[PDB]
Amino acid sequence: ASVQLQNVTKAWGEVVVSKDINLDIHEGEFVVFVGPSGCGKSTLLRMIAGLETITSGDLFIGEKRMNDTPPAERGVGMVFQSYALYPHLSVAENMSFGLKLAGAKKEVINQRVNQVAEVLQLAHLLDRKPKALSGGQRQRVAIGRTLVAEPSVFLLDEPLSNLDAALRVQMRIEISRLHKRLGRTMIYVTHDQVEAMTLADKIVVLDAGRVAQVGKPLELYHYPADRFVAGFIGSPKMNFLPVKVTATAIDQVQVELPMPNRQQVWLPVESRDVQVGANMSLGIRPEHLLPSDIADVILEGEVQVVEQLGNETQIHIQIPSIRQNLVYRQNDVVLVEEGATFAIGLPPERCHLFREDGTACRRLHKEPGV
Amino acid sequence: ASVQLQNVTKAWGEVVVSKDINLDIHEGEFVVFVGPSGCGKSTLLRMIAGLETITSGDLFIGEKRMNDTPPAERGVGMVFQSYALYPHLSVAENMSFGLKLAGAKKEVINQRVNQVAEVLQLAHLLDRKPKALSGGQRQRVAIGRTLVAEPSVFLLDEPLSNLDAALRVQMRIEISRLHKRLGRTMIYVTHDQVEAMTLADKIVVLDAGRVAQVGKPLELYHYPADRFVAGFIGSPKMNFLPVKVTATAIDQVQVELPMPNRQQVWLPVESRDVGANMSLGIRPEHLLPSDIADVILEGEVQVVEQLGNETQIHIQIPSIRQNLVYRQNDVVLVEEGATFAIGLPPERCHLFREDGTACRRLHKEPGV
Amino acid sequence: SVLGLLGLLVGYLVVLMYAQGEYLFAITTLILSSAGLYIFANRKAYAWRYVYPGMAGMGLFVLFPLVCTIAIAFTNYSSTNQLTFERAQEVLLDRSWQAGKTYNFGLYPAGDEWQLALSDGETGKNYLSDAFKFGGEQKLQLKETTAQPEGERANLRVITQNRQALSDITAILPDGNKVMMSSLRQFSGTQPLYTLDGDGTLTNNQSGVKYRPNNQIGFYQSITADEKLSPGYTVTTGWKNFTRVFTDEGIQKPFLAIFVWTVVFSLITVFLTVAVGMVLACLVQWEALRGKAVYRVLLILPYAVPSFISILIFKGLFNQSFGEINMMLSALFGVKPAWFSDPTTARTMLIIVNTWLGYPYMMILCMGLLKAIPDDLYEASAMDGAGPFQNFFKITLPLLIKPLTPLMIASFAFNFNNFVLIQLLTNGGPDRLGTTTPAGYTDLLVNYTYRIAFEGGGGQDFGLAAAIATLIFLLVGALAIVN
Amino acid sequence: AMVQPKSQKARLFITHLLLLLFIAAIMFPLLMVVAISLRQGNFATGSLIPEQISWDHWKLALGFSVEQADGRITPPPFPVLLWLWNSVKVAGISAIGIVALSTTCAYAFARMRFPGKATLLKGMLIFQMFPAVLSLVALYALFDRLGEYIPFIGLNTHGGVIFAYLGGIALHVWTIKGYFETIDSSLEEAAALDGATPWQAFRLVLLPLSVPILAVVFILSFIAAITEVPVASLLLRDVNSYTLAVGMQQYLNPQNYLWGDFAAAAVMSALPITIVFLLAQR
Amino acid sequence: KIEEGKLVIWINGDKGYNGLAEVGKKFEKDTGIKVTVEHPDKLEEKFPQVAATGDGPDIIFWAHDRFGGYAQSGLLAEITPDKAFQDKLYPFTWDAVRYNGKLIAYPIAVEALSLIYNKDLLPNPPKTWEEIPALDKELKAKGKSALMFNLQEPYFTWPLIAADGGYAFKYENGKYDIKDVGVDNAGAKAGLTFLVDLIKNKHMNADTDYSIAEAAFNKGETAMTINGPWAWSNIDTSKVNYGVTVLPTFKGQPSKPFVGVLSAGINAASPNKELAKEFLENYLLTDEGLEAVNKDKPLGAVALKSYEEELAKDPRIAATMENAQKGEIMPNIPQMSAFWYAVRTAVINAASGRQTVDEALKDAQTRITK
């Protein structure tokens, strides 16, 4: 239960999707692969599972190479995106099929299935068939299958994907309690950043086959390695303002906004490998923006959209300077009419800066929980 | 355009899946049907659409009766959950299908197709086929079809259900800006309470084929009618603590907590109609720090979700099989298992009866 | 475990192919059976284990008769010239001529040991054997006698029960000739018709004429030191049957004529069977229609009736002057279409009949295949305001044809060689006038080639038809690969 | 239950009639045979509807002799129920054999990789386009020489006829292949992770999900074998070995045209496939 | 491969096969050997093909015309009847079954076509073909028809053709000159052109088979018909008051039908030649055996002299023999097969109207000689 990759590579014909990637996943670590649709989350998971070949590179699980080893003999169990429930078999048989075939032990099955069905609450549906079960129930059957199998490593391929928002939120808690109870390694594919931040001890952001960044939830959030990881993590997306670089210092970097009021501001950020007169993206999360009265760097424009979430208010502002509405976020309700003028404060301490290639300038402001 | 229902009912011979329910959807009003799966959201939309028959009652679209009227002549369009794209046709042929048949117009099609293709960015995908397109692209082609039709009412059966979360988040902004541009009536089915809150001018919550409550998102949020509506709407689920009633003044109602120390607290709430096992509703966001408020709720920290923008903390309160969830902006340094306390403001607490119906809060919440 | 036991059979039965001649069926028996043990033993060629037993049948009962019948094209295999050399000379050696005369025989028991008795009617004198025992070929030297045998005469049943042992007894008179059992009451001097010496030369014993095997025509024949012994034997004839196809004018004219009918028949059949089948398939699972299950089975009932009886009942119903179709057809109308005499009308009958047989197969196809279309396309079409005819031609049809294409080009190939229909209904249709070989107007290529080989009159040349079957097959192979 | 436009009955009512006219037209041929089987006298031509019912033709079909008032006990000319059984044996066993071979073969094509699979399947189809009617001589020769070594599958045996039909499986392999390629991969992948061998996946996962298409294939193979004439009559010489296909043509000698008897046997020969359709209501 | 121990017999369905089966029971009662009488369709067609490969029946029944071809192909075993048996049958019947001075089949009975008329409809049956058109109109307006018989088979239509001059093979004092054929000549055309004119004037139908004609006569719907002895059995059953008389004359000359002689051959491949001999000699060709067959379906004038003199007292058989003497014996040679097929084609094409009588017979003429 300690999977690890070294220069792993996949290619369909001459098309090389993923250049040599490395991962060091420790014992009992909740790892989460994240990215858009078709960025190589599932291919990785399936390459780990043995369902897909490795074109080049070493895959170890428990310090032993697994490339040529078939999926069955990898000490690994998968929860498929479609659940992969055998329609003809019952729920109990769906969960036990693996250990039913090869060493059929009636009493062993009965015990393992019922004990797993106890913790997942599938006890009263063991004699049912996959068609009868609701999606939420159907999902926990696919989970049970791996729990009954008791693999060293767990693989989950977008497990909460086809579930109701409310039920998707509830299952996250179940998976977090399920993980730290069993305490075994879990590799977890998903597109939702929300699911990564809460479940994962380590996250792997995948940009079209390339590994964008590997690290802890709060490390990725506070210190993205590039514009991609910055834009990917965040309930509402980060605001990216086109800014020209004007000056530089050892402890900070100065940049010029794209507005007619060409205001300038020093950011506490790695100045190493940056040039003056360069065009860059100012990163700033909707949550970190302050009210106008507080900060000195004001940003003012017409409000287009005002989403009242109850617990907070999300305001989209048309700044007549950048053609990309600035998203503001604030707790409690904020009575703001749509079409009305609204100003917001930009705090320099909470500002990212990404180069032409997209690489983030390493922030210098220390943040909590890192 | 001004769709409205009067005691509309659905059944399959005997068993009534949807009770006699009323809706009054005004002109140009964005309406969202919400609820879990199989609770009769799509059935309602399809009954409005004409894809399903109305077992009893009366439906009116533009102030004329439509029960017997077929779908095509209802002045309505639908975006289907599976997009309903004709795979043997191209995007352009898909979008122009509606008016290709019935009034064959060459120049009128090209105009409306390219007009809608412009705003959805499907101008380069016109020649392509649904199999070639991505989930996001196919989803836009589906809406593009209804936009080319230009119906007075828009029906959408979970249009963003299968897209990525990031793309789903993005497509609500596109939907809102599209709706306020056209300004025409939209009915929009979704399981995601977040989509309703962000999109809806009027939310209709459904509980097993029954309208629980109707009103503005912020109205349903601050003032739930019953335990389900309260439990449904809210990012993390509302905390429910069983409590015993002690006092009962005309102005407000009091309750007794189940904790080892039997604490008491008054709650500004409708006292019309003691010792009743009521549920104390309170959202994680409305909970305070323990140093501020006088009512404290200490417990053991079970799970800590570090979301970056906030920290959602689950607290094992003694004498209750329910982890009290807490929520606070920015990151908060707390360990899993450490002792932690929080404040409970009486001005922000809901109250529910044994049956499930909610006592109306008398606290003047801003927004309503 | 079982590789040895099966491995022994691959050798036990395989060596018996080498013995008793049969080189023709000796190689394939080893090759195919060795591959089975080669595949099923080791687990490197695992995929072939699933394919082997299926392709074994393809090899044995499809490919072999094809390869075999192509080799028949390079020879004069016919009705007259059918057997091999060893069977043909064995047929000639088996027959006999009556050299002596008939003697009425009897069988009389003397304890366990039986006793025979013959009687010559020309002389009147009788003869009788000693106490012999039944079993094996034995020569009973008979003895003349005036007296009677002891023991009662054996009845027919008893002598019938010992027919095998009594036929092997080759008795002979004191100074007469040899004699064997001819019936259950008579012995007669049967002797071989021919005798085969060292070299291949049979010689008649009755007439006194020698015959030598002429291996050009494939018969035994005599030379003037002519008669032709016509059991006949097969012999190779290189590129003669094939060249006759290109040479013969009478064969060549209808050969392409029927090819037009064959292709058109199979095209029209496929179109109508699909059209009727698909239309019915849509209607049967149409929401609003009531008696679906009742309509569904009734439309399938034709398929529950075997083709060959449906054809033969139609053969009766479609009779021209009589038959029940024209009995009605000259009641509501005043006409009696010549369903058998007229080529076109007979072709119309074939198609009308064939469609009746063919549509259920297509319906059952389109029914299940139509459920591959998701419902929400028609619901989307209903929002747009499409009618039934619009739903059919704009959604259903163009969406059904794509998966249905392979099945209906496979349906084309079936009808292209639909032999049973033509033979049983029309037997080729009206005869094409002025032809060398038998040809009709509703004949397919397969029928024409069958008509050549088998049908009485107009030749029975299996070698010629075998050449045409090869000549057609390779053209369809050249057509199919390019397509 | 969608709300329907323009009256609906305009097309719903008119459809019922069109179907009613169609079923009438297509059933009509079969209505004749039933009537002919109840028609007194054995002539090829007679009244449309029987003047009086006659159980003679059915009696001798079922195997009973019939004493007429005139010409004594005329015995049953043919063992029809024997033939019926022989038709069901040869078809049913052949159909099970064709399913077993084609399904196993199609499993290899659908999933397993081995070079020259496209050319093999394409070849199989191409080779099958040669008609078995133009083999006979080679087939008779094949089963004549194959008979003396293996008696139970030679000439004049039901085994021989079955083994003959086992060859043609190109369409079955392709159709079952296409079905397999339709099926969700996660089941077989899950099964692989569960430790199931390729066979265990074939048997325990793939096959039970493929019951419908196998049921179809069986019926098509069964119907094919029931109606097969050219080969059956080439192999089956004895009357007690005949199937319907062979034996049913013995009725219609022009000079002894047993038309009414044939009709009784003909109605009875539709029984096996009907039972199959009825038993295939699953 | 023919089975030893039993006797398989083949005989045409129009003959009394059930009667012959009773002679089989009588054979089995004494010998213990089962006799199986089958009656396959196209029996005479099938035997050539099965016999050459070793298959076939032990005994084969047909008219003597197809036996020369069978014997020449090497299919028939030469029969070996002693002097005492040959003198039991009429000499000319043996001559019908003699091929190259060798007896190749047991002759059973003499077949011959006769005019079978209905007494209640037609008390005075035509002596001429020419008076049938007149007689047809008389019966047509009455609701009946004059004459319905088989036009599909030459056997039935040849008597009219050969009457005025037509012939198969000219008998060169001792032998049939096979290159000399008389289907093309004016005598054959006359009779054929007459028959066509009967169809052209609606007196008959070109598509009228044995079963149609039989149905018409046996149900009292036609006054006359043309058929052999075998057919009387069904007419007796229908109880249509009938008479068998001489065939009507065409252009002065009388109808000259081809006289058949039902004959039993022994397959050369048969392993039961000794049992076949007994059955045919001592069981079939006796008074009792022939009566058993004749009682089922009349054989005509039998070859067995003893049973013939008993049966000759039948007025139908006297008429059958009258037509037989007026006609001529069928050649036994191989080329008779060629003769029959080509004439069937000629008659059908001419009667259907696809060809002229001249052209149809001209094509036939060439098919025989080639």
Ligand SMILES: CCCCCC/C=C\CCCCCCCCCC(=O)O[C@H](COC(=O)CCCCCCCCCCCCCCC)COP(=O)(O)OC[C@@H](O)CO
């Ligand atoms: C030679 C062709 C004729 C075949 C003879 C068949 C014998 C019966 C005669 C039928 C005559 C047509 C009468 C049809 C009357 C319409 C009745 C009706 O209105 O019923 C329609 C049924 O469809 C439907 O067959 C639509 C109706 C089909 C009409 C099309 C007929 C011509 C088709 C010719 C093309 C053949 C294919 C060519 C292949 C290359 C209603 O369809 P929908 O509401 O969209 O259903 C939706 C459901 O499927 C969803 O689950």
Ligand SMILES: OC[C@H]1O[C@H](O[C@H]2[C@H](O)[C@@H](O)[C@@H](O[C@H]3[C@H](O)[C@@H](O)[C@@H](O[C@H]4[C@H](O)[C@@H](O)[C@@H](O)O[C@@H]4CO)O[C@@H]3CO)O[C@@H]2CO)[C@H](O)[C@@H](O)[C@@H]1O
């Ligand atoms: O080719 C199509 C037809 O072929 C077959 O009929 C053929 C026969 O094989 C030939 O032998 C010949 O038939 C002759 C026959 O040789 C001759 O004996 C006589 O048949 C009489 C018979 O003597 C009498 O006993 C009784 O059975 O009536 C018979 C007539 O029906 O005359 C026959 C010719 O009429 O030629 C015919 C074709 O002319 C095959 O059996 C047919 O089914 C097939 O259509």
